[PDB]
Amino acid sequence: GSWEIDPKDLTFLKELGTGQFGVVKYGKWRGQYDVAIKMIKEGSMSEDEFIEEAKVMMNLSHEKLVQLYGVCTKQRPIFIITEYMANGCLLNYLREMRHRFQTQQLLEMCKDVCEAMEYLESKQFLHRDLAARNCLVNDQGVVKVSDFGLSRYVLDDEYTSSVGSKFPVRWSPPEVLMYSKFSSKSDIWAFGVLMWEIYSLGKMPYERFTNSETAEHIAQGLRLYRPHLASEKVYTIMYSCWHEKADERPTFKILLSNILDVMDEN
Ligand SMILES: Cc1cc(Nc2cc(-c3ccc(F)c(NC(=O)c4cc5c(s4)CCCC5)c3F)nn(C)c2=O)nn1C
Numbered sequence: 001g002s003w004e005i006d007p008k009d010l011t012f013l014k015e016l017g018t019g020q021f022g023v024v025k026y027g028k029w030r031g032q033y034d035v036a037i038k039m040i041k042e043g044s045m046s047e048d049e050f051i052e053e054a055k056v057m058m059n060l061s062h063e064k065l066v067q068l069y070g071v072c073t074k075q076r077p078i079f080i081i082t083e084y085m086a087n088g089c090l091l092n093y094l095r096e097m098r099h100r101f102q103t104q105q106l107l108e109m110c111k112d113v114c115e116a117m118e119y120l121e122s123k124q125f126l127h128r129d130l131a132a133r134n135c136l137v138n139d140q141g142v143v144k145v146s147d148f149g150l151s152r153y154v155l156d157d158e159y160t161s162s163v164g165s166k167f168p169v170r171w172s173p174p175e176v177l178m179y180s181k182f183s184s185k186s187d188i189w190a191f192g193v194l195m196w197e198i199y200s201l202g203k204m205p206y207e208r209f210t211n212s213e214t215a216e217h218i219a220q221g222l223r224l225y226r227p228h229l230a231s232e233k234v235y236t237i238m239y240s241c242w243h244e245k246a247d248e249r250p251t252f253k254i255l256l257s258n259i260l261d262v263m264d265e266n
């Protein structure tokens with residue numbers, strides 16, 4: 001039921017790299033509108049499964065979400081057409097601009113993401129792979145959340161298994177590592193790690209630990225340290241995302257309220 005975009009209306013212009021579904025390109029729709037085009041590599045996605053639920057994903061509409069514009073399913077490979085973000089992913093943006101950010105801008109980035117996630121939460125829609133690498137930055141510095149829900153359609157045991165080399169262990173709460181129990185609260189945990197990515201200016205969480213060591217140690221209570229640029233109030237917010245027990249973690253509505261309160265204080 002999604003918008004079936006006419007592939008004749010797409011002009012491919014540049015390569016944007018490769019991800020879990022293969023090649024992604026920058027292009028235009030009807031000669032005018034910038035778009036990103038995922039060309040879904042054969043065998044990389046549960047395609048019929050994705051097509052069944054693409055309209056739900058398209059119905060997610062929020063300024064801080066990288067919008068799914070539509071799909072092209074009448075040939076092989078299929079295409080997913082989304083909003084284009086000229087400054088690329090947030091992790092590289094943090095690392096490339098590390099020495100220019102003021103602390104107010106770090107908090108604003110967190111707010112952008114929190115707004116998107118509060119919206120997803122209100123629609124009972126799980127991201128499942130929230131991390132700085134899956135946030136993108138537009139030409140005016142606005143951060144938006146991308147690739148929400150797509151984890152569910154990946155065909156790659158290294159990504160889908162919690163002991164696979166590609167699974168997002170460092171963004172996962174204990175109940176995901178142990179029971180594959182995804183919920184709004186596993187997105188909350190990941191958001192806390194994302195806040196840490198932002199305030200550390202793009203450091204790798206649990207650097208020097210392997211994935212299995214990270215899993216072992218977070219299950220025993222290890223938590224990420226306070227980045228130098230995070231105030232105590234900011235750290236309290238990200239740390240609240242990491243309660244061992246999922247039902248003790250806040251909602252995104254509460255987190256957004258906490259972030260706004262810090263802004264008001266400053
Ligand atoms: C200068 C510049 C601008 C720019 N802009 C964009 C790049 C990409 C993009 C490119 C390559 C990618 F590999 C991915 N991620 C994925 O494909 C997947 C992630 C996940 C998948 S698939 C399934 C499981 C969950 C996570 C991208 F999102 N997208 N969008 C919307 C852009 O606007 N890039 N650069 C270099």
Ligand SMILES: c1ccc(P(c2ccccc2)c2ccccc2)cc1
Nearest residue numbers: 029032033034035068069070083084
């Ligand atoms: C009016 C015009 C464009 C848009 P979106 C769009 C979605 C799918 C296909 C084509 C366009 C848009 C896309 C790129 C840049 C700015 C807006 C929304 C209202």
